[PDB]
Amino acid sequence: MIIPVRCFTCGKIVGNKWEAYLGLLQAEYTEGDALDALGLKRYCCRRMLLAHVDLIEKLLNYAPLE
Amino acid sequence: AGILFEDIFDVKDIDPEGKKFDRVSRLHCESESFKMDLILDVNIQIYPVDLGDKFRLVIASTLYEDGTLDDGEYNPTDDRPSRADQFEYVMYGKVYRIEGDETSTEAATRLSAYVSYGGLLMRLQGDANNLHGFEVDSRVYLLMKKLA
Amino acid sequence: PYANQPTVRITELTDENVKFIIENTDLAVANSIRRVFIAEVPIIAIDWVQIDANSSVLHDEFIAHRLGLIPLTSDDIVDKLQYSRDCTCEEFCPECSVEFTLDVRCNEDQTRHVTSRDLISNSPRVIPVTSDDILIVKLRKGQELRLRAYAKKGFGKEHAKWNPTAGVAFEYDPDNALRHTVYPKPEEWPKSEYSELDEDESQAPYDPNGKPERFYYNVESCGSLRPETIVLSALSGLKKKLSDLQTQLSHEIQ
Amino acid sequence: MNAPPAFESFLLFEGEKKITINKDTKVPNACLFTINKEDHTLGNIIKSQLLKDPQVLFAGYKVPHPLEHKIIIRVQTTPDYSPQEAFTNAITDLISELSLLEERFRVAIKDKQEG
Numbered sequence: 001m002i003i004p005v006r007c008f009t010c011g012k013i014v015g016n017k018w019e020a021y022l023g024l025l026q027a028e029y030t031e032g033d034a035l036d037a038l039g040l041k042r043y044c045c046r047r048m049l050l051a052h053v054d055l056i057e058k059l060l061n062y063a064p065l066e
Numbered sequence: 067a068g069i070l071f072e073d074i075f076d077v078k079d080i081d082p083e084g085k086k087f088d089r090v091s092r093l094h095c096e097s098e099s100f101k102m103d104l105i106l107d108v109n110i111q112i113y114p115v116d117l118g119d120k121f122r123l124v125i126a127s128t129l130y131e132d133g134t135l136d137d138g139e140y141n142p143t144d145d146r147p148s149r150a151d152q153f154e155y156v157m158y159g160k161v162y163r164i165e166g167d168e169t170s171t172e173a174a175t176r177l178s179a180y181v182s183y184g185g186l187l188m189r190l191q192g193d194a195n196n197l198h199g200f201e202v203d204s205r206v207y208l209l210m211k212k213l214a
Numbered sequence: 215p216y217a218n219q220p221t222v223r224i225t226e227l228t229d230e231n232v233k234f235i236i237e238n239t240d241l242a243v244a245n246s247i248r249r250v251f252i253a254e255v256p257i258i259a260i261d262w263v264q265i266d267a268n269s270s271v272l273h274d275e276f277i278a279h280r281l282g283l284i285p286l287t288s289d290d291i292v293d294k295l296q297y298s299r300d301c302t303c304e305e306f307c308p309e310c311s312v313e314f315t316l317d318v319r320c321n322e323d324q325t326r327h328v329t330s331r332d333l334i335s336n337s338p339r340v341i342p343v344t345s346d347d348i349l350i351v352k353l354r355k356g357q358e359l360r361l362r363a364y365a366k367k368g369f370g371k372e373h374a375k376w377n378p379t380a381g382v383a384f385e386y387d388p389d390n391a392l393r394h395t396v397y398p399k400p401e402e403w404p405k406s407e408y409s410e411l412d413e414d415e416s417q418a419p420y421d422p423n424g425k426p427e428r429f430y431y432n433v434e435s436c437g438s439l440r441p442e443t444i445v446l447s448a449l450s451g452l453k454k455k456l457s458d459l460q461t462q463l464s465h466e467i468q
Numbered sequence: 469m470n471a472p473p474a475f476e477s478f479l480l481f482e483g484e485k486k487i488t489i490n491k492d493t494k495v496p497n498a499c500l501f502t503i504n505k506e507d508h509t510l511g512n513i514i515k516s517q518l519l520k521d522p523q524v525l526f527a528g529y530k531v532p533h534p535l536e537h538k539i540i541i542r543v544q545t546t547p548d549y550s551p552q553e554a555f556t557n558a559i560t561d562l563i564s565e566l567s568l569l570e571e572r573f574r575v576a577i578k579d580k581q582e583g
């Protein structure tokens with residue numbers, strides 16, 4: 001739905017890296033290079049950014065009921 | 067004394083049937099004096115023995131070298147002089163079988179005594195005279211010391 | 215019949231992790247110290263989220279759960295703070311909590327990112343550690359999120375939000391000298407970073423007289439506490455637990 | 469629904485004793501310490517420190533059930549030394565160990581920061 005705050009396994013902070021991850025990908029980085037640049041060494045943390053599907057961007061297409 | 071048996075053996079085979087337990091080896095050993103055949107499972111990991119070694123072996127009823135019964139219970143705080151201090155490798159088991167070449171007519175000339183030290187098995191074959199101290203379902207201590 | 219004389223050697227000390235080595239100690243003390251790193255170091259994390267208005271796409275419990283997971287700077291305030299259950303108040307006074315206020319209205323057409331920057335604390339010592347900032351929620355034009363929440367002292371045993379560590383690496387016997395693990399094919403296994411063997415061996419020779427010692431630690435902080443603060447608070451908390459147990463045991467014996 | 473509250477794994481409720489001693493009648497000089505609202509953190513460390521003592525003939529611990537929060541520590545000792553004395557001495561040894569470790573860790577932090 002949205003990027004999780006913590007890494008599920010180790011508890012490292014990941015929610016403050018989704019926008020940076022996408023920005024690095026727009027800079028033509030391989031995904032491994034992007035995750036290395038963000039400093040996620042353990043594959044538990046890398047799994048979350050590598051496998052996250054951001055559906056909130058799609059949910060924001062619908063107008064709010066206010 | 068309480069020493070049911072004593073000898074010096076030499077290892078003539080280490081693990082004859084191929085390695086089957088990564089920490090335990092079934093030594094086959096001969097005795098030069100008593101001419102007993104010995105099979106004995108030894109934990110080589112803590113007490114490594116290789117082929118051709120020699121060692122004094124002693125099977126004893128007790129360890130306190132006074133005839134005092136051991137009670138068959140683990141007492142780490144023992145002030146009595148233990149016979150185990152004169153040996154490198156010490157195991158504790160129960161003789162569970164005494165076979166022989168006896169017929170219904172005559173007694174045994176050769177006896178084979180089997181001991182199970184917690185699972186590590188030993189067999190001692192030889193003439194009957196030296197195995198009269200062995201009797202089934204009795205506790206024994208195997209004391210082994212390598213000889214130079 | 216008495217304590218060991220443990221010796222410390224810090225190999226690395228950054229602002230996000232501390233790597234050190236403890237020699238002359240039994241395995242149980244080191245394992246309990248790692249356990250206390252994970253589950254018994256108290257920090258300050260958000261609890262009691264009261265939502266006044268939430269027209270975002272994410273439901274209320276989702277936002278509260280995300281707020282709970284935000285780490286807060288609690289380096290020096292947590293020790294003098296009290297557990298709210300023990301405090302004598304309406305459960306929220308300055309001596310047992312820290313108030314937070316969020317009030318975000320997305321008026322522009324562009325997607326509004328409600329981050330941890332938008333969390334306003336009433337105490338300057340306690341802020342989100344990122345203050346990139348942790349995204350809480352994205353809002354559309356016309357959407358609003360407005361809430362007030364508090365932050366209490368707790369430790370990781372109660373809930374994982376209070377866990378200060380982002381992964382505690384712990385190791386001992388890097389060459390497998392004690393053979394506490396038995397590799398079927400030891401050649402296939404990579405050398406640990408603390409290994410001291412050459413590139414022709416796979417394990418150290420077996421040591422029957424060996425005992426576990428020289429435990430290697432790497433404590434990575436999520437951010438709420440400095441790693442050295444995590445270790446010091448951990449040892450203090452374990453000592454406090456043992457002293458309290460001694461007090462209760464003495465009362466029982468008398 | 470039936471999920472227990474998270475706080476009732478380290479908190480004693482009203483009228484619950486932190487630690488209770490019971491003599492083991494099967495063996496002389498043996499006691500059982502049932503400590504409530506504890507886990508392997510204190511069990512394993514206290515067991516190890518008791519094993520370091522030479523006068524302790526037996527020292528073990530178990531959690532009866534993981535969903536419950538108790539540790540039963542059985543301590544048997546030589547006849548001239550009580551289990552309660554051994555338990556207290558073990559805890560004092562652990563406290564001294566951790567205090568020394570705190571001091572040395574602080575010294576190491578100061579050297580690494582200065583360095």
Ligand SMILES: [Zn+2]
Nearest residue numbers: 007010044045
């Ligand atoms: Zn992770």
Ligand SMILES: [Zn+2]
Nearest residue numbers: 301303307310
């Ligand atoms: Zn209060």
